[PDB]
Symmetry: D2
Subunit: 422 residues, 4 copies
């Protein structure tokens, strides 16, 4: 029964043609949904009661669109998101962190606009986790956003939105200085011919996957759901194909900000993403990602490939990783393991930000400390196991890969262990 | 000899990539398509696309197959639609550069237990009016196809039956349905109501993959550019859906309400044409050809052997086209199954085969009407030169280009066994 | 039949990985194809008798090597006359006649920097006595090949020059040497003294790989069956060395003292024949064909385009042979470079091209003696039928087999452009 | 180039020109062959073990010391000739020569002793002489048995029974010497510790022109199973009387290594020939060149794809460690092992990195020479009070021995493989360490 579920016959295929021929509508997904959902906050999704239903439906990142709305309005949206998120903190083994992303208005007819400088300052003061920087055309645009975040915003992730021809042509220099990319198809589809957007999307997703940096697919994914309870056949296909392309995150704009079915739109993206993730051809994908990732003498990089290889060898249910900044979890995610990457961290911000990386499931550690560092490490790993069991990630008899480091502090991951559950 | 500009166009850097990851990384929005659009467009006829003048604009925009939906309208209404399509098509017989065969497909109302009485009468109407194809609704098993075949009677055995898979049973019994059908339609409208909406992409990708393996035409249908029923431009999800259906391996793409009742029928056809051309250049031929080659069983049929040799030869010289002589369309279909980048120019005397080969990706039909030469070898040579001169006129070929030419050793269907490499003079 | 798929290592040939290919090799799977790697036998006191040469031709000798390091011009002229008498003793049966090339192996430069005066005289003797090939000793750079070519004069333009790589400089300047040579000999005797003995296998494997990439003949030479100079059976290392030279990709394998002075010249030829046939069936064609196609550059030459299409077609139908008409041998050489499993039966009127094509693996030359027919298409057909009749008599072909026939559109060399699938009747 | 650009800047262009690294990074086997370079010098320690047959030319203690220095890893005693007294003296001379280097534990080289049986002769199974010789083997503490003329699984069960309860730790390598042994290979390999392709008798039992097919098939199946395979007979035959081998002989040695043989053997070349030490040196020189010429890119991919999914943590850790070693061009993989099994599971994936196996078992240290690329280090210190400290001291002993022997340099990355509790069978940890 195990080998019939999660498209495993299609996963074991010798060719991509045979992989397609073996896809089965009766093969049910088993793994947890790995592609994060970004939902735009607006009149349809601002109330605390509404935000609780959206978190339960699968929202991982709340996007604030600063093109419209005053600072007072956005501060109230942030407070409502935080109230809804913290209403589930009473059960630490099931608590789900939710990131807050600030999407800038943009340069308009201008580099960095004066309104963007003020909005980025607001973002730092209100503790936002991510910035979706609008209309990024070159590396100096990213440097300007970084400077506007100041010394207190050094930890905020900058996701550059590629929205025009120049952004596509200067993609490599933009990606190099950004934490990730958003394929902002709305403006891109007006700036370049509509029939070419899929080429830009597939190229940018491919280059982000090669670089091991998060990539978001955005705009009109389930557009008809703004007024209708069910999406079109093209919309479900678009969501599935964005996941198959390699997108780390998928996004909802008007569907959740102003539409009549915000919760249903989140549920639909969750249902499609789970089905599409099981349909990924891991046999060729892992081989290509492994071959393309450069040779490295960084122990975190070396441990990550060894751990993902070990996970595939034993059909591991999960890779449990201890991380301070999220980096060790991101390096595991870049190889696209089928095994869930359960990231145990004490940092509330890193727990929110790792939603940008496909297949990273953040767990915020709030248990009492242990006097012996090795005992504290073991307890965090056992916490990952208990949370995994409660959430359905793990069962007794499963094998897990555990990734830790040799000393406290970030940057010292160098150990991979094979553990039997219970 | 060809120049650096040649190797920058039609996504050729992405085509030469050693891995699918590098293929994706090399896709370029500035690399313009050069080849003729190979995925056929099926447009549904209705109030928005019925007039002769509107049909002429749709043919110019790229419509290859006209679909008549027998779920609505009387036999009198459909006979007038067929006459209007034929009048619009024949209005171009004056210009060789613009005249093109256009197939007529009858889409049945559907089943109740066996074939409905209305379907028996509509299938009989199809034979009497010389339709080329039947899109059989709600096919659930092999006996459903046999019943449609029997209803095509003594005169309509040459009509192609494309089975529409619209429910769970059709998906589960897919292999037995494909075995007795000429091709398949992924009818996503009903399929998306019969099975969970989030599973339709799996059924679409599986059926396209299995049809490509079998070398039989597959159509992707329904809501591809839905918003264009009321808006002049489609959504980002809609352009993506069209591009991904082509990348999946669909031979044809379809428009329903977009052309039957919408406010922008011609613009919907133009949009599908523009996207398909871009998506066809983005196909990863290096791995696709290797996999189609490896999956296709060994064969002692000379047409199949010649087809793989010709497609291999076309890739070796970057041939502009493969010119094939065919009576039934079969030699062109066997070339098409290997997905050559070269256009398959099919020269035929059969007006029906010329219309029907639009079901096969990359087959460009040329109807030949010259009287037969007394010496057979001279009649073969005249048809090959007809394909070359048409190719020159339409922009496929230029003097100095190489073309692959596929013919047989004796007259009649079933004897294709020769591949030649010709330099265009 | 099931028996067909058990023979010639076909289970190991269909394997998905090289590891599985090795695991499926079967000592009970008998070879079926004709032996494709040519055997070069050095002529000497043990092999000069006309009657002994007849037995060597029957055992499988394809090329007779005359080592100009020993013996006078008078001795070598008698060797040539003896070889020709033995070869022509079989000319009375044209369907079974086996051409045999004559190769002159030069003494070399000695302590000099380039072409020695003795080599100038020996090369002139070679042209005057009509030798087919020159094995040029100690080639160190491209100018060494040019000097050999100049010494052959205007009458020796058709002689093939095979450069012997025997030292470090030859290995380092390999690319420039191969570019101007017709082929290469891995001359392991001197190479194993000029560079460390433990590195010779790296030079052999590299040079064979580069010659296969270039589509030019490569010969493996020296001590392959050394112990057979005095013993009736070779060592385990010797049989392994012959098998591995064929698996590496050598077009020819050579015997020196084993046929020139030893007590078992006929047995040494028979042993190389037996090993080569076993090793050729153990070649992993699945990966080899894919790599040769991928590495071979795109081409606008119709002979090259026809060759890849024909080899692809032969693999698709398990063709027993590819019958090719050739004037210079070039059309057969372009088929051979893709390493088909199908035998390349080359029909030619050129007695010299018939001898020289033994340098290309899997090319079986047939010398056609009939004067040209009045109708060129009939002359072409008679030559193809001669290939079929010779193939049937020699065991290459049987009724029911499929063959690929490669011809051109007009008389004269350089116009090959047609591939045809034919059933043997 | 982007996949190796940062590491090329860090390690230098000279590093990437050595050990056939351009040929190793090739995208196809054809390009791999085209890039093989006679000027690309081997760097890694020789991984294919050399078995030398002991006889009149290689019996003295002084001659045995030179053979150990030349690279002999396993001493073969051919019980087809010589009395029990003759073989006991050969064993004593080998042990005296081996123990003459024990004074420096960081450089000591273990040497296995293998007993090669006379065989069944005209009989259907285990002969009476073999029963007595196998009992002698157990009484004299031999590490390995090369069982002659194995034709079926019951032949190996008979050898195992003749070793008795005290010989359970002895490795049985079945010699395949006839058609029946080749046909029943799968059942023989299943119950054996490894195989010897005994080409001398095989080449008389089956057509001589078919032996290469049997050799390549058996090496392939042993590599698939992760069990040692030995290539034997006439590899450097002419070196019995000549100081240099023929071109076919060097080719045969190189091709046995490229085929996948864990061990290569010398018979008359060391037992009775005039150049026993030179024969060992020649096999050492060819094996190092051939090991660098292995196409690891495809070999590793095929070994991973063919190896079935496993829930054994030693197997899972082994593949993770070999993958990690390739990622960073690790100089070595240090593994703690009691029986040799954790080192054998690393060896089956054919890492380019040397597998430095630290063990307290003197017998396991000798037996792991059967597995390609395993370098045994015999640890002689008594156990620490705290087990985690004892584990750490053994890892440091591997690093210190590695540095002293030239395997490891400051700045290198090493992969360390250990287990979660004492005793055999619990390997489950892989660590990446920087050498300081
Ligand atoms: O156009 S193809 O050659 N696409 C191959 C293909 C498609 C997908 C994958 S992936 O899923 O491993 C993958 C996804 C993203 C990556 O960044 C990556 O490195 C690998 C591999 C290969 C094709 C189409 C239809 C066919 O029926 C056919 O046989 C061949
Ligand atoms: O015959 S081939 O298709 N390949 C042989 C090949 C391919 C790969 C390797 S391995 O060294 O990775 C390897 C060795 C042993 C194994 O158990 C294994 O799993 C892999 C060796 C040899 C060939 C020959 C010559 C060519 O020039 C050409 O392009 C192709
Ligand atoms: O992913 P990051 O940010 O590098 O964090 C990984 C770090 O986490 C640890 O596993 C545990 O460290 P702490 O005890 O400081 O939380 C370290 O050993 C390792 O260096
Ligand atoms: O594709 P089909 O229907 O088999 O037709 C291919 C046939 O066309 C030809 O090329 C020409 O035949 P006709 O002259 O009868 O049209 C035949 O030699 C060949 O058998
Ligand atoms: O291989 P080559 O030397 O180019 O010879 C091939 C030539 O042989 C032919 O098939 C027959 O030519 P001939 O009639 O002159 O022998 C030509 O059509 C073709 O050009
Ligand atoms: O390779 P083997 O025989 O399984 O030995 C591996 C064993 O060695 C160890 O690393 C150390 O064990 P000991 O302390 O008993 O020597 C164990 O943790 C592990 O199970
Ligand atoms: O700004 C955006 O999100 C867009 O244009 O898609
Ligand atoms: O009938 C159709 O085309 C459908 O249901 O999609
Ligand atoms: O000259 C030769 O043939 C050699 O050195 O091998
Ligand atoms: O016994 C042996 O070693 C042989 O026959 O090779
Ligand atoms: K915005
Ligand atoms: K209908
Ligand atoms: K000579
Ligand atoms: K013995
Ligand atoms: Mg925008
Ligand atoms: Mg329907
Ligand atoms: Mg020489
Ligand atoms: Mg023996």
């Amino acid at each position: 029964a195990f080998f019939q579920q999660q498209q495993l016959p299609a996963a074991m295929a010798d060719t991509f043609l045979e992989h397609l021929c073996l896809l089965d509508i009766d093969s049910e997904p088993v793994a947890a949904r790995s592609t994060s959902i970004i939902a735009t906050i607006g009149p349809a999704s601002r109330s605390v009661e509404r935000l609780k239903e959206m978190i339960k439906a699968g929202m991982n990142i709340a996007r604030l669109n600063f093109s419209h709305g005053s600072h007072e309005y956005h501060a109230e949206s942030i407070a409502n998101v935080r109230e809804a998120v913290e209403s589930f903190a009473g059960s630490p083994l099931s608590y789900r962190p939710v990131a807050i992303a600030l999407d800038t208005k943009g340069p308009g007819s201008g580099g960095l606009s004066e309104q963007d400088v003020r909005d980025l300052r607001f973002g730092v003061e209100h503790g936002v986790d991510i910035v979706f920087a609008s209309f990024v055309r070159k590396a100096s645009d990213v440097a300007a956003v970084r400077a506007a975040l100041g010394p207190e915003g050094h930890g905020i992730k900058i996701i550059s939105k590629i929205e025009n021809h120049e952004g596509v042509k200067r993609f490599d220099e933009i990606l190099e200085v950004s934490d990730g990319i958003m394929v902002a198809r709305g403006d891109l589809g007006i700036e370049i011919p509509a029939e070419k957007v899929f080429l830009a999307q597939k190229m940018m997703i491919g280059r982000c996957n090669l670089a091991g940096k998060p990539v978001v697919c955005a705009t009109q994914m389930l557009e008809s759901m703004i007024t209708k309870p069910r999406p079109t056949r093209a919309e479900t296909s678009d969501v599935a194909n964005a996941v198959l392309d390699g997108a780390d995150c998928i996004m909802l704009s008007g569907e959740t900000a102003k539409g009549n079915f915000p919760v249903e739109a989140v549920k639909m993206q969750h249902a499609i993403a789970r089905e599409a993730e099981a349909a990924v051809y891991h046999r060729q994908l892992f081989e290509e990602l492994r071959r393309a990732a450069p040779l490295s003498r960084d122990p975190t990089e070396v441990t990550a490939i060894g751990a993902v290889e070990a996970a595939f060898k034993c059909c591991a249910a999960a890779i449990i990783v201890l991380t301070t900044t999220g980096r060790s979890a991101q390096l595991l995610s870049r190889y696209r393991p089928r095994a869930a990457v359960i990231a145990v961290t004490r940092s509330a911000q890193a727990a929110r930000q790792v939603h940008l990386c496909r297949g990273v499931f953040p767990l915020l550690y709030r248990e009492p400390p242990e006097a012996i560092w090795a005992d504290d490490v073991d307890r965090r790993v056992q916490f990952g196991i208990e949370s995994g069991k409660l959430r359905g990630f793990l069962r007794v008899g499963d094998l897990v890969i555990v990734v830790t480091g040799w000393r406290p502090g970030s940057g010292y991951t160098n150990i991979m262990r094979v553990l039997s559950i219970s």
